[PDB]
């Protein structure tokens, strides 16, 4: 029933392949993004609760190394910041401001690393949402002109050789419109949820940096 | 080309102009993309190596082993530390005053790094906006020619005006080429370049903090 490529010029086939697998890539990105975002979300409340669940400062670090490499999110931020904190503290590191700023350094850099490595493939969604109808319009208008120039070779409104051109026009515009929906479905919701992730990661940042501040002025 | 040839020279002229923009745009995309991607990971390599339990003067002499071929955060470090030591030399600015000149040196080096990495980028924005409008500029003129021609002939109902507006619509088609890659490249390279800008910026702040600490201890 999908007799598309059998009767297809080079350009229509080009745009169709440029858009179909592109859309399936758009859904694959949806699946991966929602999976990782939900996984991080469920970890967020649990870890934040365990922050003040009676686990003293050192104990969380001592138990963190069990999953040292397979560590992510706020817990990974904790691991990096606190391990470099104790690295500095085991040395002289006499200046409290020095250790505090090193803590801020490590926390914010690890928080960034998590923010980007979780936040991937996202602007591609906006790009496709922008240019998918425009590519369809290209295919359609080229189909229009390709048949309209040929129309100037006959006299009567034959309408028999134009039908392939009409099919090309409809196919181009339809496939161009096809990818528009999932693009915007991804972009806004994913961006807002990632912004919430950034918000509570920042919360963790200033919170545990204040904790480390008070700890450094405590020891 | 077979059906492209129109008597109006403006059509050929503007199509060649757009094709030239097509060449420039794609060349800029691939070249700036490769250069920017190559320069990207060097920043994180420096970030890892810098604080991997090393001494600042060791990194400075290492950079002095890599003179006059220096790019990225290594250049920022070299400029900042050479400015620091030269302004920290005997009978010079106060310990709290050298850091301002050092910050200026690192910052102007950082700016230079931006534009010499961000060289051809705004051309993408310039071309992307104008290209469809140029395509319409062509097609309206072609339609004017075709319609004044149609004004005199009798009958020939839709059997002669075909090229007069088909080779006008091609102007819009070529304008539509010229818009697509340019805008996406402009965007994505803007976010990547601003990411690098933020990296270098923060690095400047904590490096100024480190220099203040050194001046306190030196």
């Amino acid at each position: 029933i999908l007799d598309l490529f059998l009767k297809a010029s080079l350009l229509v086939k080009l745009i169709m392949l440029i858009l179909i697998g592109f859309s399936i890539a758009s859904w694959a990105i949806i699946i991966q993004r929602t999976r990782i975002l939900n996984a991080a979300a469920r970890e967020a409340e649990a870890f934040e609760d365990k922050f003040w669940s009676g686990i003293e400062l050192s104990r969380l670090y001592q138990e963190s190394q069990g999953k040292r490499d397979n560590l992510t999110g706020s817990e990974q931020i904790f691991y990096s910041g606190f391990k470099e904190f104790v690295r500095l503290h085991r040395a002289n590191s006499h200046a409290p401001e020095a250790v505090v700023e090193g803590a801020s350094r490590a926390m914010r850099i690890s928080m960034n690393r998590e923010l980007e490595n979780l936040e991937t493939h996202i602007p591609f969604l906006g790009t496709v949402g922008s240019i998918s109808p425009y590519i369809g319009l290209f295919g359609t208008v080229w189909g229009i002109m390709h048949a309209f120039i040929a129309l100037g070779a006959v006299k009567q409104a034959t309408l028999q050789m134009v039908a392939p051109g009409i099919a090309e026009a409809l196919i181009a515009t339809a496939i161009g419109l096809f990818a528009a929906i999932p693009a915007v479905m991804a972009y806004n919701r994913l961006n807002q949820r990632v912004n919430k992730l950034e918000l509570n990661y920042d919360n963790f940042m200033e919170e545990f940096t204040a904790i480390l501040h008070r700890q450094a002025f405590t020891v | 080309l077979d059906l492209f040839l129109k008597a109006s020279l403006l059509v050929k002229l503007i199509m060649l102009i757009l094709i030239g923009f097509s060449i420039a745009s794609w060349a800029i995309i691939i070249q700036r993309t490769r250069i920017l991607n190559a320069a990207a990971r060097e920043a994180e390599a420096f970030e890892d190596k810098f604080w991997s339990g090393i001494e600042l003067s060791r990194l400075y002499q290492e950079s002095q082993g890599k003179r006059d071929n220096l790019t990225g955060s290594e250049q920022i470090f070299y400029s900042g530390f050479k400015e620091f030591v030269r302004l920290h030399r005997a009978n010079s600015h106060a310990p709290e005053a050298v850091v301002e000149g050092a910050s200026r040196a690192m910052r102007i080096s950082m700016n230079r790094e931006l534009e010499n990495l961000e060289t051809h980028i705004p051309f993408l924005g310039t071309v992307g906006s104008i290209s469809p409008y140029i395509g319409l500029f062509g097609t309206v003129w072609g339609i004017m020619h075709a319609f004044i021609a149609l004004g005199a002939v009798k009958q020939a109902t839709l059997q002669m005006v075909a090229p007069g507006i088909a080779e006008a619509l091609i102007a819009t088609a070529i304008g539509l080429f010229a818009a697509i890659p340019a805008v996406m490249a402009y965007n994505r390279l803007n976010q990547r370049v601003n990411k690098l800008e933020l990296n270098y910026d923060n690095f400047m702040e904590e490096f100024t903090a480190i220099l203040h600490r050194q001046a306190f201890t030196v």
Partner: peptide, 27 residues
């Protein structure tokens, strides 16, 4: 860099001429 830009220009020219050949074959 200008020689590298000319290299990329050559690559882009190859891409455009082959696409234009495909266009003429279609038409």
């Amino acid at each position: 860099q200008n020689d590298k830009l000319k290299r990329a220009i050559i690559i882009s020219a190859v891409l455009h001429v082959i696409l234009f050949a495909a266009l003429i074959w279609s038409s």
